[PDB]
Design a protein around this nucleic acid. Sequence first.
RNA 1: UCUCUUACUUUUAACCAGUGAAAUUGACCUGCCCGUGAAGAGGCGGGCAUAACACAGCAAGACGAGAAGACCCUAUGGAGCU
RNA 2: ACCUCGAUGUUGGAUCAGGACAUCCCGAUGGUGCAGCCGCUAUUAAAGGUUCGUUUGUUCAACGAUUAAAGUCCUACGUGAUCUGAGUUCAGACCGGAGUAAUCCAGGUCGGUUUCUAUCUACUUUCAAAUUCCUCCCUGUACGAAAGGACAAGAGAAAUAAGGCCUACUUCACAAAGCGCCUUCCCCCGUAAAUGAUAUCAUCUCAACUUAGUAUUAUACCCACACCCACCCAAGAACAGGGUU
Lengths: 102, 189, 337, 115, 38
Amino acid sequence: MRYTDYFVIVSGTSTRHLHAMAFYVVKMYKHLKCKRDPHVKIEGKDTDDWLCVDFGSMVIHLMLPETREIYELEKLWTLRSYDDQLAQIAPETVPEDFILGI
Amino acid sequence: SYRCRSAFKLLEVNERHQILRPGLRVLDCGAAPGAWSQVAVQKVNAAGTDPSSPVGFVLGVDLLHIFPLEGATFLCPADVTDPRTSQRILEVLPGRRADVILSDMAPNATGFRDLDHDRLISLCLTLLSVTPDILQPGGTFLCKTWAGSQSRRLQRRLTEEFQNVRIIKPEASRKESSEVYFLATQYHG
Amino acid sequence: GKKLLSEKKLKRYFVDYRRVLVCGGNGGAGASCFHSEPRKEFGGPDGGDGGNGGHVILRVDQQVKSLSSVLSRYQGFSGEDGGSKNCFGRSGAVLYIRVPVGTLVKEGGRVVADLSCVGDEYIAALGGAGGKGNRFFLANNNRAPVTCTPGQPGQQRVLHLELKTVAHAGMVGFPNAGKSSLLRAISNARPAVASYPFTTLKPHVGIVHYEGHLQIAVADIPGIIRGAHQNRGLGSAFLRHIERCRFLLFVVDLSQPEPWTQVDDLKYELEMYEKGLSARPHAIVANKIDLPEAQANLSQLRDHLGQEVIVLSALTGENLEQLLLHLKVLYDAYAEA
Amino acid sequence: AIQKMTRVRVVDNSALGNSPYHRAPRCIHVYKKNGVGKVGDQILLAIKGQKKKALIVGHCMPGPRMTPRFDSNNVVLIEDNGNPVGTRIKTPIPTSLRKREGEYSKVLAIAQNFV
Amino acid sequence: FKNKTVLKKRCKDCYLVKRRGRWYVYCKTHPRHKQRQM
RNA sequence: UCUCUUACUUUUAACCAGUGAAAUUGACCUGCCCGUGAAGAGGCGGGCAUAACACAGCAAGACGAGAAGACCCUAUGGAGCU
RNA sequence: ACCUCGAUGUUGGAUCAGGACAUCCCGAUGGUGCAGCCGCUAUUAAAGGUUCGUUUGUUCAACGAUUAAAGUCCUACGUGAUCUGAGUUCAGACCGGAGUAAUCCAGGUCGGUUUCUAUCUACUUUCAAAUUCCUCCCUGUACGAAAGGACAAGAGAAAUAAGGCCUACUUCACAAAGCGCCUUCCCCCGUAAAUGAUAUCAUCUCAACUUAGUAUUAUACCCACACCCACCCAAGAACAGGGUU
Ligand SMILES: Nc1nc2c(ncn2[C@@H]2O[C@H](COP(=O)(O)OP(=O)(O)OP(=O)(O)O)[C@@H](O)[C@H]2O)c(=O)[nH]1
Ligand SMILES: Nc1ncnc2c1ncn2[C@@H]1O[C@H](CSCC[C@H](N)C(=O)O)[C@@H](O)[C@H]1O
Ligand SMILES: [Mg+2]
Ligand SMILES: [Mg+2]
Ligand SMILES: [Mg+2]
Ligand SMILES: [Mg+2]
Ligand SMILES: [Mg+2]
Ligand SMILES: [Mg+2]
Ligand SMILES: [Mg+2]
Ligand SMILES: [Mg+2]
Ligand SMILES: [Mg+2]
Ligand SMILES: [Mg+2]
Ligand SMILES: [Mg+2]
Ligand SMILES: [Mg+2]
Ligand SMILES: [Mg+2]
Ligand SMILES: [Mg+2]
Ligand SMILES: [Mg+2]
Ligand SMILES: [Mg+2]
Ligand SMILES: [Zn+2]
């Protein structure tokens, strides 16, 4: 899975609490950052419930408990093709001879 | 005098069909700036200009604000999609009913044929849902629609509820324009 | 870039109350001309309509913090007049008036808007409808020049913009009870503090930080006096902020021989302003306890006011923590849901 | 290249995208200085009598060499916020989406296949 | 700087000069008093 | 059709050879800018420029060429219709 | 007003623009009732830029989505021997109305012929010395009660404009092209300062003078000249140009 080494999900109390954490983590990152280690960008500051920060080999997701209940990111990444959310949705096939009937 | 040239479209439709009569209750939707309300009040004598002729009633509901008129009351801002606004229409109309429905409402043209069509037709579907408690049996219904795919769909459900569905394209309306008016008289059910 | 040090009399800049006459954009319009062509010399009537007047809206801005920026009279932009060639006038652009967060709009005895939120708007005046042209009125019957009228000047509305400072808690006390001092102690805010009475004329908001990433705003108003209903002292004009404040801080100095009578005077004057203010929930706080005379009178305070009253010093910051506990507890009590 | 008045395919588990309808979704607008939109670019959609923002994820027009080239124009419905309305992306998305400038991390998070 | 055809005094501190071939009014107490000949 | 145009073929084209028109034309050794002419200058005034001579393109100017004149007025001019 | 323009009418639109600044955006300043962020007003600046759809013949306007902004004009309301003919215009017809009628109408509606082989003037590779948006760093800092939120310095990505090119992709195939790739470099003339007289203080100076400020220039490209058999050519209408060991 050609994305990252380590995926991290953390929850928060309030919207402003999430900003606190994300902004501390990025701030501390820069302190301990290697010179050649590229700079990072926080994502979704405008967003209410979901914040994300990508590092080199770590990816972190800051959410409310509300968004955790609807995204189930842990389930997706632990078991890929076998999750419940993929099961409900079925691929649509065109009919043979390509004729629709009512 | 008329606040917009839209009033002339109603005049052409009226003369052919005699949709507006003295002492006949009228509901106008999307009334503002009030060209359709101004032309309606003259014919129904809601202003009470003619002593011998009976006096009607006109109400107009629109999102944008409207100046007051003689013999007409307005409720704005209001949206017909909102069911709350319907009860406010109910209370003001005398005799618990409105005899005439005029629907010249149209959501702002985005400039895409498909998107504009869908919103206006579905807006008329909401009107059709709210007809029973507003429209008196044997009452007349007039709605403004853009031409498209689901124009036929709107016709089919109109033929269920009304005796006759009359497709009108007025001369006052630009010939090159795609706007079409559906008239539906003799309400049953 | 440095903030300029402020004079005590900063009430010169800060404005809480303003009478505004708002008028929308005028119709303008008016064309009564005639088209001519080489082959067709008469051509026909040729009058463009005019654009509609722009509306006036009191958009709320966070970064105004005063009603000083609003003017006595506002006039909306009028729409362009109709020209020849059946050219229409452009409608006027919308006029926006930026107004503080704690603003309230009153027209004719009753409130029309309470714009106490962020981004919320109220239409101050409707722009007037643009007049008709010569091309309008053309029919089979006419072929004639009437320019109508300019038509519908913008709507004239007189309203009172009134600022009520929005906070969770306010402070009430006699002059030189050390309200400003206490605010300076608990918050990072710097209100002007001095020994001479009737300081801090402008209301001062500081917030208090907590561990749960939540902030509680406390307001400091100028000193109040017994009476104040006859506009004695500074009056009770500044009391407008406290309406929005969820609870009150009764700051009482122990320097005075009978501090127990202080709260009695305070509750009486609040009643004089508004009935429910006296019945409104509160906390009583004593100040300047570093002085020995305060320590002497403490016993009789315990006798009259009781144990529930929290005793504090501002200068030395004595028992500040109990205040913070009480602030948080009152918030969690009746400031929720 | 997805420009104005282009039919697109919504490759989401979102209700709005997968709903049966008489119209295919159409590209109202492209958020780029020039009108053409490649992968990663945002575009506005007219679906089911409403406007919705969407992210371009793969397209038929050939791109840079080692980058994949799809057979349908695939978009993911997003809110103005940046939050995707749907929860899952069945269809593979190109990995290139990662390094490109902007809010792509969330969409990567809900995708299963990278090509 | 405000463009004025005729130049006036707003203060005692306020002073005139002829610079760059035009008259100016400078003011240290109130820099708002500044004027330029047009 | 367009975004946004491309490539090739044929016709034309351009060159060599043969045949050989038409509208048009006061005379011309026939420049640019500014002013004048109220508008309108290759040709008048003040400046500037400037060896001579073909061929290929272009259409800004020559109030460009060609017509049974579009419109308004006049004639003690006609004609059709009522 | 006028014996000045127009017998292939005029409005719009296409193409291509030239110019003015009374500057819409980007640049440089002064003041502010300029904390910071947006704002309000004035000076200076025309090198560059200034969107796409729907309705209507639209010029306008309204509406929708954008942008950094979607400027105000002039040019025979620029330009029709470069192009359309949608509206309004000739012969046909209808509705409504006027008129005894023939016929008419500043209304509504349908249809309706756009010629030219360029003689003269003018012109046909002068230089690009490239503009802008966004993101990150600073920094989430200064500032600020908080909410919010900078400037210089620097890094990366794009978009267009100009000039090229074909190794890949693409239309294609000894090649030519874009949908693809490569390159793209100076500052502004408004003010901010000293020292110092008339007027022994002071004062930035249409005083003598001293710094921001060079208060004017690049650098770059080209640059030899037989036969003018014939052939070839990444050169080309012809002519000329390059190669022919
Ligand atoms: N000894 C002592 N003096 C104090 C203490 N707190 C305040 N003071 C004094 O009391 C003064 C109170 O002045 P302010 O805080 O301006 O008074 P106020 O209560 O805001 O009332 P106004 O003067 O009307 O604004 C301070 O300037 C100090 O001199 C305290 O804890 N101990
Ligand atoms: N559901 C709805 N109910 C009422 N008004 C609506 C509406 N949806 C749209 N509108 C409004 O209706 C307006 C058009 S109605 C105006 C018709 C015409 N000018 C007249 O003479 O009355 C739009 O500006 C829109 O804001
Ligand atoms: Mg005219
Ligand atoms: Mg005080
Ligand atoms: Mg030829
Ligand atoms: Mg020959
Ligand atoms: Mg001839
Ligand atoms: Mg001249
Ligand atoms: Mg001549
Ligand atoms: Mg020639
Ligand atoms: Mg004649
Ligand atoms: Mg005669
Ligand atoms: Mg005369
Ligand atoms: Mg003439
Ligand atoms: Mg200027
Ligand atoms: Mg002119
Ligand atoms: Mg021409
Ligand atoms: Mg035909
Ligand atoms: Zn002064």
